[PDB]
Amino acid sequence: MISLIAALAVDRVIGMENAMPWNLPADLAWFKRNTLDKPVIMGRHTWESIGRPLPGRKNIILSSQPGTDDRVTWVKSVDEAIAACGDVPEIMVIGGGRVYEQFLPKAQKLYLTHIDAEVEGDTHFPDYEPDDWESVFSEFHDADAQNSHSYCFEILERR
Amino acid sequence: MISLIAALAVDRVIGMENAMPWNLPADLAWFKRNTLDKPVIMGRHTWESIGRPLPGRKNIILSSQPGTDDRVTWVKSVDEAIAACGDVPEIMVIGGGRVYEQFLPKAQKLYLTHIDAEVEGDTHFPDYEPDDWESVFSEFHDADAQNSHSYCFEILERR
Numbered sequence: 447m448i449s450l451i452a453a454l455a456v457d458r459v460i461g462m463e464n465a466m467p468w469n470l471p472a473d474l475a476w477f478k479r480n481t482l483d484k485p486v487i488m489g490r491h492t493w494e495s496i497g498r499p500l501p502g503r504k505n506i507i508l509s510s511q512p513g514t515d516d517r518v519t520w521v522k523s524v525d526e527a528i529a530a531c532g533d534v535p536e537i538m539v540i541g542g543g544r545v546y547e548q549f550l551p552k553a554q555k556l557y558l559t560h561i562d563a564e565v566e567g568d569t570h571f572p573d574y575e576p577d578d579w580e581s582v583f584s585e586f587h588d589a590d591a592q593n594s595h596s597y598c599f600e601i602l603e604r605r
Numbered sequence: 606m607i608s609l610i611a612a613l614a615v616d617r618v619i620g621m622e623n624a625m626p627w628n629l630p631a632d633l634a635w636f637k638r639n640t641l642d643k644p645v646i647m648g649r650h651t652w653e654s655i656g657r658p659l660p661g662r663k664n665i666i667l668s669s670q671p672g673t674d675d676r677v678t679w680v681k682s683v684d685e686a687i688a689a690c691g692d693v694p695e696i697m698v699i700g701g702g703r704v705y706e707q708f709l710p711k712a713q714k715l716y717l718t719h720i721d722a723e724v725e726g727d728t729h730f731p732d733y734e735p736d737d738w739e740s741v742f743s744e745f746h747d748a749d750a751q752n753s754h755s756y757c758f759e760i761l762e763r764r
């Protein structure tokens with residue numbers, strides 16, 4: 447099963463030119479815990495930004511480009527992407543945008559981080575129809591000494 | 606010779622209850638670079654924000670309470686602290702708020718990082734009579750893929 451995971455700001459903003467202005471270790475931590483030991487699919491840019499494969503996980507890159515790093519697996523198609531995940535219980539899509547778009551329709555579960563932040567982004571998580579999904583988990587947290595903003599943990603299952 | 610280093614948001618904001626909303630890897634670099642191979646004087650909470658002893662530097666913590674970590678050197682005054690530095694060309698003072706207050710008077714130089722952001726502050730960089738200093742270096746930068754905000758670095762010497 448495919449699952450998407452993402453951090454979202456107000457308006458479903460997920461990306462921009464510049465570095466996101468916020469400090470969410472707790473989020474990083476959530477992400478971690480939810481991806482660890484699972485295959486992860488991501489696009490080129492994401493891969494770039496990250497700059498090293500994520501330890502503990504089968505890193506799969508979705509590009510058209512040929513890719514240098516042999517530490518990961520590159521693929522050119524959604525089908526391939528999936529193919530490369532083998533026999534697993536959950537496949538985790540980590541974006542970006544188009545990636546999310548592509549996988550959304552195959553996606554059965556979503557892990558979303560809702561951040562109380564307002565920014566001018568260039569990228570947005572694809573709109574999804576609420577009526578189609580069920581919140582089976584949600585967990586609010588205020589900003590604290592380590593998290594610059596308040597944010598909330600949500601997991602939706604496809605209805 | 607004494608110097609102070611700090612990064613100030615608008616209005617001398619240097620701290621908040623919660624996490625600063627910005628991510629400035631470049632300022633840290635600047636910080637590292639200007640503090641390396643010199644004694645760094647800090648106050649207890651910074652030290653606790655830092656969590657470990659800064660490599661390449663000699664860590665002096667000014668406080669009322671008694672040590673907790675054999676690694677660094679604890680002092681109770683500004684004279685001791687200054688003492689603990691020994692004969693060295695420049696002593697770097699690093700915060701927080703109180704500390705900087707107590708050293709401001711003896712400083713001959715300021716290493717400032719003016720951050721482009723409005724935040725409701727809890728601590729502030731000591732006020733300093735701009736007439737009393739000469740800017741001797743300044744360097745602007747724009748926010749980018751790695752730094753959420755724009756900032757300018759500056760060095761001021763006591764006139």
Ligand SMILES: Nc1nc(=O)c2nc(CNc3ccc(C(=O)N[C@@H](CCC(=O)O)C(=O)O)cc3)cnc2[nH]1
Binds near residue numbers: 476478495496557
């Ligand atoms: N919820 C969510 N939060 C995110 O930050 C996020 N980021 C991406 C893509 N960007 C990144 C960037 C960095 C790392 C990363 O460094 N991950 C480390 C966490 C390291 C830590 O705890 O410092 C990992 O080992 O998973 C992952 C994804 C995708 N989905 C997200 N989804």
Ligand SMILES: Nc1nc(=O)c2nc(CNc3ccc(C(=O)N[C@@H](CCC(=O)O)C(=O)O)cc3)cnc2[nH]1
Binds near residue numbers: 612632640718
């Ligand atoms: N310009 C400036 N920026 C700061 O962030 C700052 N911080 C303090 C006290 N706060 C801190 C907290 C953590 C680290 C720290 O990890 N420093 C590393 C750099 C690490 C890196 O390159 O990630 C060091 O080794 O110097 C430093 C200062 C004092 N003056 C400052 N001054």
